[PDB]
Design a protein around this ligand. Structure first.
Ligand code: CA
Ligand code: CA
Ligand code: CA
Ligand code: CA
Lengths: 130, 130, 130, 63
């Protein structure tokens, strides 16, 4: 009640807590990649839609928000659909949006972000080619 | 048997119970968010299916139950699949369902619920944009 | 606190961990197929575009990179579009690219790769007909 | 759990089927499926904690 009720359990406690190793830490960091890589095709593929109706892409200062809402800064868009070509803007969860480039150096458009490092254009400058 | 059997254990009891601090309380509340955020894409994405066959979304009074069962209140749906586009209706565990809006103010459709606060349209009005 | 706090839980632990069987392993391997099969039409269909402007296909050593960038190795291409007929080159995730053949034995062109086996021209020689 | 011996036969049945092992309900029962389900394509049932078939603890799917 004092010893058997305790001593037997002290062992069972450590014996239990000792051989219970669930998993690692950092698997979410790997997930951050595909979350952004998923955006890549989704970004360019979505921009291509706007590149079809208005026959071109939005400006840097015009930002991806133009894909979210009608491009107030000129040039204006024709047959801009409801809410643009996206429901909402994917916010990079490190305090940054997906900064597009007008014109892109790897093609028609380039996109960039701080990324997990939280630094602009250092190592986690992903968003397109580089 | 009376002192060693006890006094030694009284210490072991408190020494054990003192330095055993497992965790916090409230982690489940954080989980309630993703549980609802998971619905968000699942809700709109599922509604989009109905927006394809019948080329439109169900009415407010028609509710999300139309996604569960054939929409009895008109307009009627074409090629409505078996059991609609969902197995069962996700019940918000605070006494509320996911009230859709016909038409949505943030787009084609808007969804709302009481939420953890259990209040209608106060702070936990999540279900879509707002 | 020592027995009820433990013994009841030891059961709940095993009772829980025992009847929680989520899924299999190897489903991704099945996905590797369609990922490559998706390339097949995308490869030949994309090459056909180059077969239109320059009225022919790129050379083996010229590789699919010619579809990525202007074909430096002659013959030269006419009206080669921006960045060629593709954004980027699909890299087979087993240390190999999609080796084209100039001329193909199953037609105008043939493509090959190591594949999941990681072996050249053994079993996972997919990329076109064979 | 294993390839369906009773016909109809399955195509591209993966290794060991779609599960490691069968979850045994710890009250002397397995998860009895229904062919075809009344709440949809398939329905599942079990004795449950009551240990009674189709009384109160008939969970396994919709009902
Ligand atoms: Ca950076
Ligand atoms: Ca509220
Ligand atoms: Ca091979
Ligand atoms: Ca029963």
């Amino acid at each position: 009640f004092t010893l058997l009720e305790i001593m037997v359990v002290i062992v069972i406690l450590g014996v239990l807590a000792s051989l219970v190793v669930p998993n690692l830490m950092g698997n979410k960091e790997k997930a951050d990649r595909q979350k952004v890589v998923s955006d890549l095709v989704a970004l360019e593929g979505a921009l291509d839609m706007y590149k079809l109706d208005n026959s071109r892409y939005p400006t840097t200062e015009q930002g991806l928000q133009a894909l979210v809402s009608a491009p107030s800064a000129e040039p204006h868009a024709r047959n801009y659909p409801e809410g643009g070509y996206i429901r909402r803007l994917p916010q990079d969860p490190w305090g940054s949006d997906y900064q597009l480039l007008s014109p892109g150096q790897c093609g028609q458009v380039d996109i960039f972000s701080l990324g997990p490092d939280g630094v602009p254009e250092s190592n986690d400058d992903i968003g397109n080619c580089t």
